[PDB]
Design an enzyme around this catalytic site. Structure first.
Site: not given
Ligand SMILES: CCOC(=O)C1=C(C)NC(=O)N[C@H]1c1ccc(S(N)(=O)=O)cc1
Ligand SMILES: [Zn+2]
Length: 256
Positions: A60, A90, A92, A102, A115, A195
């Site tokens: 994704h 990463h 988006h 986002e 992010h 998110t």
């Molecule tokens: C239990 C792990 O916790 C996490 O941090 C993440 C998970 C589950 N999934 C991901 O693929 N990577 C991490 C993640 C970090 C930040 C965002 S965001 N987009 O910045 O809100 C999403 C996922």
């Molecule tokens: Zn993110």
């Protein structure tokens, strides 16, 4: 789960009910409704380029992961008393330049969003422990505005040819992601969530006021990444941005 009509944001609530929670991200930041907060300290980042570890195609999106075994790479200040340890960055992006961010600012959609994610190593002993806790995660969000090519993205973009398909991973070393941040670290903050699933309400968001640039061709590189595994029919990663969610009476604070 994914970003398709069938497995996408509007369907996430069936398996992850927290999708309809009171602390969901991202949000529209209404500048008329923000509260200037005098207690907010400057954001302080100090990242050691030696903590950069690996770039991974996760189907994704793609992630750049950091060694997180100590406090070599840390976020401090802003609304925090604890030190937060860097673990990942990463992006988006959207199917077109017109959307892809986002977070939005007064309804305006940017082309992409960076992010930089951190976990509370003062209070918790691992990312896995920190990830579900109200004060567990700190994520800096940088709005990316289509315009001039951004030379700071160069190492990241050059690495994608090695991780074109899902599950592919490669060393990604000697990189300080504070080089990607805007020169002003004036910010908004609010209590929110991851998110995407599992959408844990564990994130203190730090949203930069200042955007960074990205070219239409740099964005094309992200969308040329493939969601499929090697040998399968090519399926471009066209978008991975969640719609803005209700504030449900939370307050966005301004450092400025
Ligand atoms: C239990 C792990 O916790 C996490 O941090 C993440 C998970 C589950 N999934 C991901 O693929 N990577 C991490 C993640 C970090 C930040 C965002 S965001 N987009 O910045 O809100 C999403 C996922
Ligand atoms: Zn993110």
């Amino acid at each position: 789960w994914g970003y398709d009509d069938k497995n996408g944001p509007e369907q996430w609530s069936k398996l992850y009910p927290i999708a309809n929670g009171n602390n969901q991200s991202p949000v529209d930041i209404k500048t008329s409704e923000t509260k200037h907060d005098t207690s907010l300290k400057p954001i302080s980042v100090s990242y050691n380029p030696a903590t950069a570890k690996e770039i991974i195609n996760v189907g994704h999106s793609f992630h750049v992961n950091f060694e997180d075994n100590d406090n070599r790479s840390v976020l401090k200040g802003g609304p925090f008393s604890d030190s937060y340890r860097l673990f990942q960055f990463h992006f988006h992006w959207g199917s077109t330049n017109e959307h892809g961010s986002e977070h939005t600012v007064d309804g305006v959609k940017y082309s992409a969003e960076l992010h930089v994610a951190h976990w509370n190593s003062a209070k918790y002993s691992s990312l896995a422990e920190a990830a579900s806790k109200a004060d567990g995660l700190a994520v800096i969000g940088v709005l990316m505005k289509v315009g001039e090519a951004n030379p700071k993205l160069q190492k990241v973009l050059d690495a994608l040819q090695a991780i074109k398909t899902k599950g592919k991973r490669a060393p990604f070393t000697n990189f300080d992601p504070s080089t990607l941040l805007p020169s002003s670290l004036d910010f908004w903050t609010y209590p929110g969530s991851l998110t995407h699933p599992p959408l844990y309400e564990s994130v203190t968001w730090i949203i930069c006021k200042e955007s960074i640039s990205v070219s239409s061709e740099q964005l094309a590189q992200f969308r040329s990444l493939l969601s499929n595994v090697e040998g399968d029919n090519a399926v471009p990663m066209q978008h991975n941005n969640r719609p803005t969610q209700p504030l449900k009476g939370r307050t966005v604070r301004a450092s400025f």
